[PDB]
Design a binder for this molecule. Structure first.
Ligand SMILES: *[C@@H]1O[C@H](CO)[C@@H](O)[C@H](O)[C@H]1NC(C)=O
Ligand SMILES: *[C@@H]1O[C@H](CO)[C@@H](O)[C@H](O)[C@H]1NC(C)=O
Ligand SMILES: *[C@@H]1O[C@H](CO)[C@@H](O)[C@H](O)[C@H]1NC(C)=O
Ligand SMILES: *[C@@H]1O[C@H](CO)[C@@H](O)[C@H](O)[C@H]1NC(C)=O
Ligand SMILES: *[C@@H]1O[C@H](CO)[C@@H](O)[C@H](O)[C@H]1NC(C)=O
Lengths: 604, 127, 49
């Protein structure tokens, strides 16, 4: 069972430098007297590490509290312990650290290690209540107060203790590295004596692999485990703990890096070189040696990276005559369909989509927000006046009088149907009967089939011969379009736009957003389909009115015409190059200089 | 893609209660003022109950005063009307509409054109 | 979005089919993600388990 402590009070972190530690064997192969390069998760040389006291005294009274904040676990963690009296006991790993996500617990008592993977319900302040025996005192007895409950256990492991017994300045380093890759949780370990070094000591010691765990769980945050020998019920004034917590622990975070390790003859990692630390290190990487001779060497290649992209489009008030069709005064009858075509002109579908005046938008095959994105070979506009309840009949694969007897709609549309109410423009008080509808036909119609024949249909067996009578009706009936009529009978103005998407030239395109011109900074540009990278500058050349391109002596294009306002712009790739390191012999000094070939020093 | 969808309609006993809900998809319904309308068999579409954009102004038909209560959730973009003490006179095809105020003044008592219309639900009261 | 290889997602969050947020509640353009099927001995070969 768990027992609650006092608040952590959010103590400010403390930082300290790490001097070339944490190198672990990346693989399981024996290699002798060879320099080998590896790209893997490492701890950078001369990095920041955060340091926590095991027991901290910050209150004026002399309060002793356990510094055990939760810490992020981002892709490997290096844990170093400066310790002398066996106070740390284990670790916990998870995302939520509760009964909601799978959790990992490693503990170490005086006998062995316990590795457990279950759905533990942890308390806010896990610890191990430890005490000595009244006679022997050789070993410490531990009571677990780490979790409340454990369920759904999928792993168990026991082996030799991870922490050697520490039972008066004989401080030692215990260095561990945890990684979690491909569902495998790898622990690399090392133990080392030290003297009179409070921080991480300057030196080098490899990390050998200790254990691999087929856990396969997901880890984001972790917490260390500490042993309370004191009485949480009755805290002493002082000296109940351990000299105000001299023993403590340092945490560092790994990230992907490339190293050069030097295997000696025995196979022991004796030195390593970080590759991106400083230019001399980059030279040692590129030359693949531990020592660099005097001279000049080419190591890397400098290159400016564009930060943004630009796309450009023309500048014309004239466009597709959508306004003249949608806002037209008169619209044809619904059984003699006026079909219009729009071509060789630019379409702005955002005017129609964002108008917030059209009652129905129904696009099939193309999303309505990408209507301006795509280029269509042709667009057919059909604009008529239909009753409200029959607006639903205008869609692929539907039935009804208009759907069947008027105009069949195929099931493979790539186009849009748009409708807006026309009560105040089409209806009159006395009834507008200028739109005629047929209710009887011999058979259902073909897709995109127009019939205007006015022959009187034969409902019975006797022939009509173009004359009404018994079982003989004229095809077209009138609608009572009135401003007082209901929703189903009021007139709605409907336009269908069918887009032709074939392997054919595109005459209808969306200018989209004419991205404002941003020059004198090499950007990713896309002019009328040309995609490239480079800097745009004003140029005094003159293109012919039909010419859109400018070519160098080679195939590389240089100057492009601005569709908005001509003033030809010219393109220049933005200053690539190469970095050289000027250094003397490394046995003299490690100071270096950097030279950037073929570029001045403003973009560096 | 502007759609107004009504729901909750059906058959109820006279003197009973019903609740009707219209939702907006493809656009935010908070900006618009919302009116609940009905059309009875053989009658024209009359104004039942209107609510403002912010919900601070409401208007009711005199036939439904003291029986119907209109409300709105701008967070859930949904407009509700609660019916109590329903009568056989309330059997109608029932529509939700959204529009912006066409006249000066806060109150929504006056009528105008209505921008967006749903398909509506049937409300039948008979026993 | 499409998923990473061998990636396990167990989340039961109600997806937002529209622009309005569902906040874990179904409704308009809001649905539970999982659907079940009538695995039956009389179904066609294409629909057998
Ligand atoms: C490490 O900490 C010091 C201050 O303690 C800070 O100035 C330095 O920039 C940190 N390291 C890096 C790489 O920023
Ligand atoms: C681990 O959990 C976090 C949320 O706590 C999530 O963002 C991440 O995708 C998870 N990783 C895996 C591999 O599921
Ligand atoms: C390590 O190498 C030294 C010489 O450098 C040799 O004397 C010693 O025996 C080697 N030890 C092992 C364990 O290989
Ligand atoms: C097209 O370019 C001219 C350049 O003088 C500009 O005045 C005009 O505003 C541009 N068109 C639009 C719609 O902005
Ligand atoms: C770039 O370097 C050349 C080399 O002399 C220099 O003349 C030119 O002015 C430099 N450009 C800028 C923008 O400083």
């Amino acid at each position: 069972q768990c027992v609650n402590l006092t608040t952590r009070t959010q103590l400010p972190p403390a930082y300290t430098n790490s001097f070339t530690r944490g190198v672990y064997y990346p693989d399981k192969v024996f290699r002798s007297s060879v320099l080998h390069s590896t790209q893997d998760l490492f701890l950078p040389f001369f990095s920041n590490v955060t340091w926590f006291h095991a027991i901290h005294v910050s209150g004026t009274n002399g309060t002793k509290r356990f510094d055990n904040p939760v810490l992020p676990f981002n892709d490997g963690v290096y844990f170093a312990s400066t310790e002398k009296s066996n106070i740390i006991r284990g670790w916990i790993f998870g995302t939520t650290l509760d009964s909601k996500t799978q959790s990992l617990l490693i503990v170490n008592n005086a006998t062995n290690v316990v590795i457990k993977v279950c759905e533990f319900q942890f308390c806010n302040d896990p610890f191990l209540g430890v005490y000595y025996h009244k006679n022997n005192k050789s070993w410490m007895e531990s009571e677990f107060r780490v979790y409340s409950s454990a369920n759904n256990c999928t792993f168990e492991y026991v082996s030799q203790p991870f922490l050697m017994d520490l039972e008066g300045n004989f401080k030692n380093l215990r260095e561990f590295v945890f990684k979690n890759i491909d569902g495998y949780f790898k622990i690399y370990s090392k133990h080392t004596p030290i003297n009179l070094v409070r921080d991480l000591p300057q030196g080098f010691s490899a990390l050998e692999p200790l254990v691999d765990l087929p856990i396969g769980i997901n880890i984001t945050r972790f917490q260390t485990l500490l042993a309370l020998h004191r009485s949480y019920l009755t805290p002493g004034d002082s000296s109940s703990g351990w000299t105000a917590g001299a023993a403590a622990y340092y945490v560092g975070y790994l990230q992907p890096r490339t190293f050069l390790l030097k295997y000696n003859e025995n196979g022991t990692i004796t030195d390593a070189v970080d590759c991106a630390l400083d230019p001399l290190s980059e030279t040692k990487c590129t030359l693949k040696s531990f020592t660099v001779e005097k001279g000049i060497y080419q190591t890397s290649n400098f290159r400016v990276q564009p930060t943004e992209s630009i796309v450009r489009f023309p500048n014309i008030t004239n466009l597709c005559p959508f306004g003249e069709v949608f806002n037209a005064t008169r619209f044809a009858s619904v059984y003699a369909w006026n079909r219009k075509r729009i071509s060789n002109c630019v379409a702005d579908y955002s005017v129609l989509y964002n108008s917030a005046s059209f009652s129905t938008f129904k696009c099939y095959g193309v999303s309505p927000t990408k209507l301006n994105d795509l280029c269509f070979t042709n667009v057919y506009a059909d604009s008529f006046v239909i009753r409200g309840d029959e607006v639903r009949q205008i869609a692929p694969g539907q039935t009804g009088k208009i759907a069947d007897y008027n105009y069949k709609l195929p099931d493979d549309f790539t186009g849009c149907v748009i409708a807006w109410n026309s009560n105040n423009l089409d209806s009159k008080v006395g009834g507008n009967y200028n739109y005629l509808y047929r209710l009887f036909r011999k058979s259902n119609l073909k897709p995109f089939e127009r019939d205007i024949s006015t022959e009187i249909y034969q409902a019975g067996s006797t022939p009509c011969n173009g004359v009404e009578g018994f079982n003989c009706y004229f095809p077209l009936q009138s609608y009572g379009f009135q401003p007082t009529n209901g929703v189903g009978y009021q007139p709605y103005r409907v336009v269908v736009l069918s887009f032709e998407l074939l392997h054919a030239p595109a005459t209808v395109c969306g200018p989209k957003k004419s991205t404002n011109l941003v020059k004198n900074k090499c950007v990713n540009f896309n002019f009328n389909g040309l995609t490239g990278t480079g800097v745009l500058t004003e140029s005094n050349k003159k293109f012919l009115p039909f010419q859109q391109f400018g070519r160098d002596i080679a195939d590389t294009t240089d100057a492009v015409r601005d569709p908005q306002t001509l003033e030809i712009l010219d393109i220049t790739p933005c200053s690539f190059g190469g970095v050289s390191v000027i250094t003397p012999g490394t046995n003299t000094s490690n100071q270096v200089a950097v030279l950037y070939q073929g570029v001045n020093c403003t973009e560096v | 893609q502007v759609q107004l969808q009504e729901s909750g309609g059906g058959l109820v006993q006279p003197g009973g209660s019903l609740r009707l809900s219209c939702a907006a998809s493809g656009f935010t319904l908070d900006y618009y003022a919302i009116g609940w309308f009905r059309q009875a068999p053989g009658k024209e579409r009359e104004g039942v109950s209107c609510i403002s954009s912010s919900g601070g102004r409401t208007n009711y038909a005199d036939s439904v005063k003291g029986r119907f209560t209109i409300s709105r959730d701008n967070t859930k973009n949904t407009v509700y009307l609660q019916m109590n003490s329903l009568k056989p006179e309330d059997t109608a095809v029932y529509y939700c509409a959204a529009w912006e105020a066409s006249r000066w003044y806060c109150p929504l008592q006056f009528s105008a054109d209505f921008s967006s219309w749903g398909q509506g639900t049937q409300v039948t009261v008979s026993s």
